[PDB]
Amino acid sequence: MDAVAVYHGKISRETGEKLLLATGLDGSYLLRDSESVPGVYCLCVLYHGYIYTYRVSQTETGSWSAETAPGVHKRYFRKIKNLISAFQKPDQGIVIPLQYPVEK
């Protein structure tokens, strides 16, 4: 999914943290592969020095969703860009909205 500008398919978690931290800007975000769950992705956003990371998975039928807390309705999205657009809006259940894309 190279068409996702914010997707960095060759970086590690550590590399992901350094890129975000380098922005010095809360709300900066990227997507990377998980280094713990093969085949899963990680949506990473900077807040007060820490990188809040949401595992993102594709369904057996093609749609996308983010790890969701217990007792909360999970949302699915046809396109990854759609999931990303949703979480750029205020009050969607992540620590701060996705605000500044850190692009390839």
Binding site: G16, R75, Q92, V95
Partner: peptide
């Protein structure tokens, strides 16, 4: 560790 694995809360 600077990475925190969080979950969508809404």
């Amino acid at each position: 560790s600077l990475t925190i694995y969080a979950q969508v809360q809404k």
